[PDB]
Amino acid sequence: HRIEYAITNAVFVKADELSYLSFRVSGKVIEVYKDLGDYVKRGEALAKLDPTYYELEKRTLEKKMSALLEKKKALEIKIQKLEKGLHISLSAKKLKVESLKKKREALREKLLQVEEKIKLVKLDWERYKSLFQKGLIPRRKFEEVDTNLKVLLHEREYLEKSIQEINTEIKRAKKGIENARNEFKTIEELKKELSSLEEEIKSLKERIKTAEQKIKDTVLIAPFDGVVAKRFISRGDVVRAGQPAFALVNPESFYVEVLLEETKLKGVKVGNKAYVRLDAYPDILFEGVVEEISPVQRIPVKIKITKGDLSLLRVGMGGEVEIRRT
Template sequence: MDQRVNRPERQSDDPEINLRTAPDKETQAASEAVSPPGRARPRRLRLRLYGAILAALIVIGAGGWWLWQQFTHVFVTDARVAADIVAISSRVPGWVTAVDVIAGDAVHKGDVLVRIDERESHLRAQELDAQLAGVARRREEIEARIVLTDHQTQSRITARQAAVRAAEAALAAAKAQRNLAKTENARAEKLAPGGAITRAYLDQTRAALETARQQVLSAQAGLESARAAVAEAEAARGELAVLQRQLAELGPEEQRLRAQRERAALDLEDRTILMPFDGVVDQTFIDEGEYVTPGQRLLMIHDPDHVRVEANIKETDIRFFRPGKTVTITVDALPGRRFEGTVTRVGQAATSEFALLPNPNPSGNFTKITQRLPVRIAVQQDDGELKPGMMVEVEATTGD
């Protein structure tokens, strides 16, 4: 028989403490009356056992899940977001007069990025415009001289040709007169010995014949002079050919000046550097007032809508990354987000082949190291959150 000794509990001097402890004692007494004190400890032990079993099941499940993932998936941590970053350079030298953008700006195609001093280019373009205008004036002058010379020489030739025809007619008339005088003289010479004509008439026929002969010579000289005048007029027309050659020489000169003018216009245009496409400015390397040289890098830009993932895959896992394979991408900067990507290109050479210091292993000592091949993965941009250089992880299944 359990003998219990009821000892009086020590009462506190504070009445409030006695009031607070009184209900607790009554509750404890009720619980002791309902549950025997021997059954409380086994119940706690069972709860601890159940907790240990549940924890073990959780650990086993997590480990099983991890093992299943390792056997059925390939995880790649050496991957980054990439984009085609374009370096904008200057084609002309000069002082920078304005830099209209800074790193991080979103710029539309055709917006001004950088301005370079263009005063000298303006002066050169004006000089070439003046030379082209001078060539045009010279062409007009030569063309006018050609028209004038053509009219003058043509009218002169026509007049000389008419003079030739008149000289030919005069020569024909002189010859006919000479023939008539010759016939008259021959008749007089036959009749003079018989006394049929007088001596004076004979002398007249002889004088008329001589005069006719001189007129023929004069007519021949006039004809030759007229023909010489025609030749002179035709020779003067040769000046047209000289003027035509001068006009032809203006063509190459004008073409040369136009090429220089286009080059000057191109130089002037290159002094205002425009955005080639819609994108963002990644970094600027110059400030207003600096002097730049041809080929100097001014700033770097890229199109945020065209990004990709570039990963270096172990050669033992490259068989799981065929073109067209769908993979899962997680970004370190965006926890909880998962992106879907598609393998678009697999490199044809390991990254070690492009090392600055290749290792030909001439000594014969060899340590086998797993090589990596570059893989490009297409991924859809999400409101510009994927930025070049971000670290990502790629997950691919080992099945087809």
């Protein structure tokens, strides 16, 4: 027909790089949104699994979650009720030490004044004694001093027994303070449990987060723009994680493969123009160059596409092809 053009009807649309899609979890397919031949946009849902199980699993965890928030606050009350069972309780024993210590400092000063007087009257006593021995004073004057000294002396150790008695009671109130140091130590023992509870919560929020992933993974969405080259699954099939559900072809992957009789290969060569008419698309002329030639006896020639709507091609399409001789 034309010696400028090798013409052939042995043409196959093929795909170099396709990708297999899978669910990241296992389950029962319940819906198929896309089929063999569909063009799909990155993000589209292709198919969906029954999620009830993964949703139960999540909510089984949300039960146990609120059952650990009904303990966290249960003994956040308990530990803040023992924390005020010692604050108003210690501030009271503190004032009855700051009240005994002032009541004591009142005595220790009246005791000092009395000890002042006793110092003087002791001297008078010594003197008046010596003067009575020598006949230089009446006895009336010396015993007068003597019984004054007796008064001061037993109004003294009245003050000082009234001191060692207000000092043992103080020491007792001060031991009672040490008991509350064992109180807060048992509170901190109760507190080594609160942080081990919100540590069981920290890891539960994580198990939840992971369950919500499994639930989200029940919808198979498309990782890139492409056309569905194969569909391996049907409604009601049980699939496994990572098991192929579709094959997706990157439209840039498409090429035409031509099986050329060796005879009509005369002037054909890598780089040469080529022209493809697929039966599926009468009103479109795909266009390309000869990418490579492999070493009734036909030779496979690979054609790279350079003009025409790639999103329209399907693996397996036939038609007619003209290659330019040189």
